[PDB]
């Protein structure tokens, strides 16, 4: 129910991060801190993403 869209590629630094490509659509799964959220990609992969790299999607 909450999706965002990537504004920039993100490649992670840690294994726990979720890489993505500019324009990718992600589902938010948890918001443990303000700037880093847990998300799921179209493939079902999960990991942390940086909030400033995304925008609300639809």
């Amino acid at each position: 129910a909450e999706y965002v869209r990537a504004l920039f590629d993100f490649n992670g630094n840690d294994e726990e991060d979720l890489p993505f490509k500019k324009g990718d659509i992600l589902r938010i799964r948890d918001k443990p801190e303000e700037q880093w959220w847990n998300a799921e990609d179209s493939e079902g992969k999960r990991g942390m993403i940086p909030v400033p790299y995304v925008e609300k999607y639809r």
Binding site: F8, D9, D14, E16, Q35, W36, N38, M48, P50
Partner: peptide
């Protein structure tokens, strides 16, 4: 003439 990737925000916690 595009903007660069933003500075990655620091993580408050470990995941």
């Amino acid at each position: 003439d595009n903007s660069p990737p933003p500075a990655l925000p620091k993580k408050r916690q470990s995941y």
